[PDB]
Structure formats: C-alpha cells, structure tokens
C-alpha positions as a Markdown table, in Angstrom:
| # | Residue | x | y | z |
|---|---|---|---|---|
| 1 | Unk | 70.5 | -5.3 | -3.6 |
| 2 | Unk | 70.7 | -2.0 | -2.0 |
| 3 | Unk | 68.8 | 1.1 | -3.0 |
| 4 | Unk | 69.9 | 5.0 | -2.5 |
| 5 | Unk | 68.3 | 8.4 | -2.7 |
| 6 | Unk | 69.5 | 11.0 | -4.9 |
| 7 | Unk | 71.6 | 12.5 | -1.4 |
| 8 | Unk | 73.5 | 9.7 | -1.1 |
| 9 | Unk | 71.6 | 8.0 | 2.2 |
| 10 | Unk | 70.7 | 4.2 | 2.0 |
| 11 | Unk | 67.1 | 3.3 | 2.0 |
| 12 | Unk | 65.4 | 1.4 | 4.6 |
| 13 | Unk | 62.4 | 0.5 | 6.1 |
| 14 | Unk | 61.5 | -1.1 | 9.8 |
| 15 | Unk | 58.3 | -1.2 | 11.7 |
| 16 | Unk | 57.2 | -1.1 | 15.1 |
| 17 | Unk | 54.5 | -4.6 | 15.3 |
| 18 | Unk | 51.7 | -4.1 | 17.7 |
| 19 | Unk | 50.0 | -6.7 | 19.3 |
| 20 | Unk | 46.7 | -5.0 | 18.7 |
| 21 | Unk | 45.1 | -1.2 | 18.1 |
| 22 | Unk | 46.0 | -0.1 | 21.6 |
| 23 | Unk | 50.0 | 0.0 | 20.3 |
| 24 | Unk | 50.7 | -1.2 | 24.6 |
| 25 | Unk | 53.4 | -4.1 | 23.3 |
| 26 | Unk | 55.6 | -3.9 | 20.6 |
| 27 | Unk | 57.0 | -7.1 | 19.0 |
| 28 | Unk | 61.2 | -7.5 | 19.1 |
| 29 | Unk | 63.4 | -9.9 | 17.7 |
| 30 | Unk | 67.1 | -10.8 | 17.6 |
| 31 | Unk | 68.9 | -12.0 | 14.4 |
| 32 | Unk | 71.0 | -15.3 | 13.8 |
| 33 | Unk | 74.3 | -13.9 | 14.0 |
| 34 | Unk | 73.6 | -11.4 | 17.1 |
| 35 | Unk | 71.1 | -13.4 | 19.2 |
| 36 | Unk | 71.2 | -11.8 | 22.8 |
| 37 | Unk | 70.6 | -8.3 | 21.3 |
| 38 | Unk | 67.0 | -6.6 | 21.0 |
| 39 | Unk | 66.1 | -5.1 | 17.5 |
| 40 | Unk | 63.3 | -3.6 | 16.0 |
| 41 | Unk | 62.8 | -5.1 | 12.7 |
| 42 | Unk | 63.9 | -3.7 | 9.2 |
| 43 | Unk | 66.5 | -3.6 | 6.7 |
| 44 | Unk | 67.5 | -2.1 | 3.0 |
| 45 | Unk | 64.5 | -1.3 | 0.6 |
| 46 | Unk | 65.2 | -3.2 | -2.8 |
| 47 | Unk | 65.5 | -0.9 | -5.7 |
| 48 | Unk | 62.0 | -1.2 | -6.8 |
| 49 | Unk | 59.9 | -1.6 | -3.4 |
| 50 | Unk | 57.4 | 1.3 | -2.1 |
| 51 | Unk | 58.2 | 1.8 | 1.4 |
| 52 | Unk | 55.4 | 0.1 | 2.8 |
| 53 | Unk | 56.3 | -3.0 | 0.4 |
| 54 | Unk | 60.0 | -3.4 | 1.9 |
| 55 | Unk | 58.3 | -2.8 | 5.6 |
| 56 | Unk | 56.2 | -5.7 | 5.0 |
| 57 | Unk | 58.7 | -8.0 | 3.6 |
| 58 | Unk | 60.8 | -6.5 | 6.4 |
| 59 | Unk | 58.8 | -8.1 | 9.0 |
| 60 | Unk | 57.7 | -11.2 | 7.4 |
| 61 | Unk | 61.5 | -12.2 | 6.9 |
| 62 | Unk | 63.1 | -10.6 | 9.9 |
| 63 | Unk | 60.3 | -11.4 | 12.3 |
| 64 | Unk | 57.8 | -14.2 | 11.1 |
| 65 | Unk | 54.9 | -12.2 | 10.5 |
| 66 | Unk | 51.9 | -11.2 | 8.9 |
| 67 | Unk | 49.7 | -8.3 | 9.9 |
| 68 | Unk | 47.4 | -4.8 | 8.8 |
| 69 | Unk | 50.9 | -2.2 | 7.5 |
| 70 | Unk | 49.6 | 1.3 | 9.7 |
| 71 | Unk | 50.9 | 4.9 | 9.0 |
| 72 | Unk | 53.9 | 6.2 | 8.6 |
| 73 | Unk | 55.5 | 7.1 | 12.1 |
| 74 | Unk | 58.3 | 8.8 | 10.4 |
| 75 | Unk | 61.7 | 8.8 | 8.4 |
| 76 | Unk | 64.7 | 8.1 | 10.9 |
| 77 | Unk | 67.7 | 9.9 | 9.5 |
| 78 | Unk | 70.9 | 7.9 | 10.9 |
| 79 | Unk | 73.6 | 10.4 | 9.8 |
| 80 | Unk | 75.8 | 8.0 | 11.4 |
| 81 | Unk | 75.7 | 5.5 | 9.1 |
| 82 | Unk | 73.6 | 7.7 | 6.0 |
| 83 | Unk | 70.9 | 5.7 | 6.4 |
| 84 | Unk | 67.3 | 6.8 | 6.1 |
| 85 | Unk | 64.8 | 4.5 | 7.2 |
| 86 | Unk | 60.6 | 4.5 | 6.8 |
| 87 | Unk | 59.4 | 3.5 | 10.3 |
| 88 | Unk | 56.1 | 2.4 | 9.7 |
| 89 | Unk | 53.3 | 0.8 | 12.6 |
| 90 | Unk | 51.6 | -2.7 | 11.6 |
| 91 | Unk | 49.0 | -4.2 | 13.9 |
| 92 | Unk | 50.5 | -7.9 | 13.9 |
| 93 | Unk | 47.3 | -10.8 | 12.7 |
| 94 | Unk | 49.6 | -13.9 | 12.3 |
| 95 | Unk | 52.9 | -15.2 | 14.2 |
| 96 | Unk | 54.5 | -17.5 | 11.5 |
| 97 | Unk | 54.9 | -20.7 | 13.9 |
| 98 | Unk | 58.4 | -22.6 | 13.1 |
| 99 | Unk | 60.1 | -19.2 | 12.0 |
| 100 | Unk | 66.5 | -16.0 | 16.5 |
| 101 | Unk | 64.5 | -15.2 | 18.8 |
| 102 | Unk | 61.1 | -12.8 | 19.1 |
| 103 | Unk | 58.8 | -11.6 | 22.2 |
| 104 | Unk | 56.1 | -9.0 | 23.0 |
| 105 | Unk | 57.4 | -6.0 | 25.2 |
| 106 | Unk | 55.5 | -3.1 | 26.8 |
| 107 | Unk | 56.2 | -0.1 | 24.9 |
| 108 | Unk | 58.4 | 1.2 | 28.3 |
| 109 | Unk | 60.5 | -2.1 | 28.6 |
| 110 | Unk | 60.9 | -2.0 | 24.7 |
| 111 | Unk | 62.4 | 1.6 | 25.1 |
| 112 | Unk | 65.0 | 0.4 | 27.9 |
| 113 | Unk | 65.7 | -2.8 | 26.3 |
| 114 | Unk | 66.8 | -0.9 | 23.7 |
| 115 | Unk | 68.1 | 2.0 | 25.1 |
| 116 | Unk | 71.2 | -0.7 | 25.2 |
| 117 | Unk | 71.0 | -2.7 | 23.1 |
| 118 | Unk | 70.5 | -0.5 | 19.9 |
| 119 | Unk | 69.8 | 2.8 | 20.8 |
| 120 | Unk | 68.7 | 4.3 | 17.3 |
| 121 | Unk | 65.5 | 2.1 | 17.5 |
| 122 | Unk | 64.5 | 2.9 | 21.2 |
| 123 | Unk | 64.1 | 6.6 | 19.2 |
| 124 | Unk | 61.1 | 5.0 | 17.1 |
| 125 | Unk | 59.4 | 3.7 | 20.0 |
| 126 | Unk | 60.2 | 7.3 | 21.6 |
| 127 | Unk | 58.5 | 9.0 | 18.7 |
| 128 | Unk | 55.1 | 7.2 | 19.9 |
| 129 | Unk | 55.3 | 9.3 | 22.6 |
| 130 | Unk | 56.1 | 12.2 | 21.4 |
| 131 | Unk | 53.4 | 12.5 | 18.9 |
C-alpha cells in the first residue's frame, strides 16, 4: 500500500549503497520490467514504516542487500510526479547471492549513467557533492 503526507505528496524512500566508508562507488540496479535502465534503489514507504525502515526494505527487495542504514542525505521533492522521497546513505556488508541486474559505479559514472537514464536520481548522487 501507499502512504501520503498531509500535502498530498507520496512517500518514499531510496538510498544511495556504498561499497565502503569512503562513499567512491555507489551500487545501481535495474528492475525486471525495465532491465537496460540504471536506477538508484527505492520505492513507496508503507503506511506504518519509519523512513529508514522502508529504505532498508527498499534495498533488500530492490537490490539484494544487507548493510549499516547512514544519515539522511536529504528529502528529494519530485513535484513532477508529488513524490517525496527520504534518500538515505547505507554502507553495503552483504550482496544477497542468487537475487535484474546490479553493479558498483564510481560516484562520476553513476552521475552520467544516470544523467540518462533517470535523471531525478543522478540529483542524489549530485547532492554528495554538494554538501
């Protein structure tokens, strides 16, 4: 189920997995139905998660999984689609082996592979850099 604040925006929650501390290569994945094309993982927050909680689940289901759930890099207002979506960091401890597709980019490669392939998550690995 879906979950919405009291403005009317959808929920979400997505995080940017780090292959260590030094957050140098991000993990991305591509779903079933859309297989060449790069995403960051995330989806809807279920009515009752936390953040964090959906952001976890997030990447165990979308991505295969397990790791140490960082800070909070920020809340990505899409205004496009009234989504709002908690972008958290979460250094990645366990790849779930028979879990699509999924592979380690430098932060720099991430940005341009996304930059076309969904634009909206390039901006989380953009606000990295931005501080």
């Amino acid at each position: 189920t879906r979950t919405y604040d009291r403005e009317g925006f959808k929920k979400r929650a997505a995080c940017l997995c780090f292959r260590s501390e030094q957050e140098d290569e991000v993990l991305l994945v591509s779903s079933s139905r859309y297989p060449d094309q790069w995403i960051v993982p995330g989806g809807g927050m279920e009515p009752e998660e936390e953040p964090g909680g959906a952001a976890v689940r997030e990447v165990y289901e979308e991505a295969g999984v397990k790791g140490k759930l960082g800070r909070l890099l920020g809340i990505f207002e899409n205004q496009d689609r009234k989504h709002r979506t908690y972008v958290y960091v979460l250094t990645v401890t366990e790849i779930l082996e028979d879990w699509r597709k999924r592979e380690w980019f430098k932060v720099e490669d991430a940005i341009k592979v996304l930059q076309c392939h969904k634009p909206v998550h390039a901006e989380y690995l953009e606000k990295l850099k931005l501080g």
